[PDB]
């Protein structure tokens, strides 16, 4: 699926998933053993950075709007990285538009 995949966080391998059923949508990374769990609310994310396809690294960063919070995820397959990146882009853009509307009104 496009809502889950393998990812590495803080040098720990695990599974990253995107929970959209519960509002607001949140991105949750769980280690393989389950000892480590991380959850980030996408409403806080300001910008979405991604490593170029011409580099051996498959990193993807989410910077939170304000010492701004920074979340880094490393992927294993470029196809998985792209499939996750498009889905994340959609949600980030929608949340930014919602914030813009709220501020304007």
């Amino acid at each position: 699926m496009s809502h889950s995949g393998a990812a590495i966080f803080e040098k720990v391998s695990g599974i990253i998933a995107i929970n959209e059923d519960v509002s607001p949508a949140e991105l949750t990374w769980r280690s393989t053993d389950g000892d480590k769990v991380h959850t980030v609310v996408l409403s806080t994310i300001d910008k979405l950075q991604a490593t170029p396809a011409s580099s051996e690294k498959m990193m993807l960063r989410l910077i939170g709007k304000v010492k701004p919070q920074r979340h880094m995820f490393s992927f294993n397959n470029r196809t998985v990285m792209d499939n996750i990146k498009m889905t994340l882009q959609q949600i980030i853009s929608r949340y930014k538009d919602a914030d813009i509307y709220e501020e304007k009104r």
């Binding site: 509002s23 929608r94 538009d97 919602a98 709220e102």
Partner: protein, 49 residues
Amino acid sequence: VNVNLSREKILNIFENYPIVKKAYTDNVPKNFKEPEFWARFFSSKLFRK
């Protein structure tokens, strides 16, 4: 891509499509706001159908 909407057009959409009104009334105050609802509706396959 930018799409423009107005209050009159929103009312026309609700009048012409009762399903949209049904999904709007039960969700606008509960889960997400009207802008997010409209964006999701436009991105959804329901609008295409």
